[PDB]
Amino acid sequence: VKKGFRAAFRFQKELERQRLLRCPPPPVRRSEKPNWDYHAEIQAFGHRLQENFSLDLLKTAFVNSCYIKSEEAKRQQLGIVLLNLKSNQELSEQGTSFSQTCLTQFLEDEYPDMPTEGIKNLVDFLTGEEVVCHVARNLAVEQLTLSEEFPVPPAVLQQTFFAVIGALLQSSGPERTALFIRDFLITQMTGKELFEMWKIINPMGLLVEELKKRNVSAPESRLTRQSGGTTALPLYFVGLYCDKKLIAEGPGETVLVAEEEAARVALRKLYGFTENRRPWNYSKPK
Amino acid sequence: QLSPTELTEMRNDLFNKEKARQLSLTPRTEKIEVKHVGKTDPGTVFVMNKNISTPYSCAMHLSEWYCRKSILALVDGQPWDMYKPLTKSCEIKFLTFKDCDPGEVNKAYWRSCAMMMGCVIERAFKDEYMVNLVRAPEVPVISGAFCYDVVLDSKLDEWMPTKENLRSFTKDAHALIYKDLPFETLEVEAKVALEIFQHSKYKVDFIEEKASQNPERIVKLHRIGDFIDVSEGPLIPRTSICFQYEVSAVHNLQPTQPSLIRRFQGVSLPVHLRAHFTIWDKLLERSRKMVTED
């Protein structure tokens, strides 16, 4: 046995880190952890986003129906009205409607050549659970969300996110909210390809119909390039020709795959979603 | 009438429905006492669950050797499928291919090979042509081949299968073996069986004959995968028991005037009794000759 306390204390700290690593504790809400002041956190949320929220509306946006029904069950169990807490349902609906119309206007103005189906799919992707939940989690929405279950279910988090948009729309109006949707949802298209967000099948079928609408001859598929035809790693470039004029060209490992890619390339050009299109303008409106 | 795919779906639903009904007719987990009367492990008693526990479950209590070697069960002196639920307190013995008198085991394996042939024949012809399953004649094992009487479409009245076609039936049979499907059994009343096989005239006549033989008019149904047929007796536990299996010959039975019944023939040996390549070839040749049930 060696004299001293410092080394023993240091080793205890290390033994506690390894124990925790071996058995990671079940996660809990940030509110349940120390150093939490809900009112202060609500005010910081607006200030971070440079938005003049109304603190009454903003707090209601976070309140979910599940949290209210559960809060009442606990009250009944304890034999304890003062719980006239308004849910975010109304704000959620208002925010959801505005976002879809606002996103549809942003996208229709920028890409006038996309049909309604394409724009709808893009709005559904931008307002989908996966995208919205990612943005909400990284904006401290989940920390401020009052829910029955933790981790917050994705549907619940999506509803809360749009409730915050509803609060902003009432507080600041449509123009200020439109900038918010541009800066946190439209940005989620950065780097994305058209058909990564708009999932389509039979691109050649869609292309033929679009060219018919445009009174253009049906595209003839031709082999522009070929390498390794008889090997296990072929390369094919299939070009689509309308009136013996090249509209699109696509690579592939098979002629069928190359042809389908060429159709997708043609659709991207027709709709104005080419990789080299003019980037979205985020500059302050004049 | 119903399409071939729909007919199977109808028959399976009726089979499943009847299976569920019989299961409901047991009060919770009643217990039966099954005494082992075999030469080995003498005196072992199994306290099993009525209408759920099968002879295979009793073998599982003993060892894996019983499960692998036991092909048929002898329940109160009566041959009993390994997967047939035990219904009463009784005595049980296990039968193998290598018993001193494996006559009952041979018949059980002999009948199952015919039922596997019926399954492949029904599912082999193009949808254009109509295949009507008739019966699996009970032919002695010494005859050298098992046979299954089929009636084909009028269009195929001058067609005789080629060697490549016979090999195609064999490859389908081996695919059934590879699937390792259990032989599921159901003892249902004539009425239930007649509903399942209403579309087929031969089965209705066959079903009626079996019901008449028994006072209670209960008919034995078996199923492998999605194929349901009516059987003469207990079958083997699984299709994986078969190791060497080949559809040898198809004969046209006489008289041909009323209807052209085609006797499909095959021969097979289990894993336990697999024969050498040379010996197997000699058996295939005799299997290709016509057998006349007596």
Partner: protein, 154 residues
Amino acid sequence: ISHGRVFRRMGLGPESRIHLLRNLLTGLVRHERIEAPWARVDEMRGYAEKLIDYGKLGDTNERAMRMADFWLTEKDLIPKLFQVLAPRYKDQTGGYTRMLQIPNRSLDRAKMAVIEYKGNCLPPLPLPRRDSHLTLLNQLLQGLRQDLRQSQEA
């Protein structure tokens, strides 16, 4: 190199090998069934077969009596050879003994065999039996045989 070398190297040399085998053979004549290492029983089995042939020559053949005197170290067994064992095999030309492998010896895991003179009074060994003629394979072959015999007579 040991091409065509039919005898094993046993004991402490050629003489000891014979003595080792002789003790085994003497035990067999008395008890009519003994267990010993498989290799040693296999070596001794040949002598046990030939001893009977000498016994069949009879007790009046002086050469047979000398052979029996050497190989049987217990002299009460010499009358047994000539008057019990050899008469028992009067109607056979060979195959007087049966040798079967038994489970390995516990101590040193030596491969073991049991050897006995056929026709003894002892409880029978659990001999290996071929499959019944009633098995599936044997019945299919019986059919093939029946069929081949019928076609030949025609």
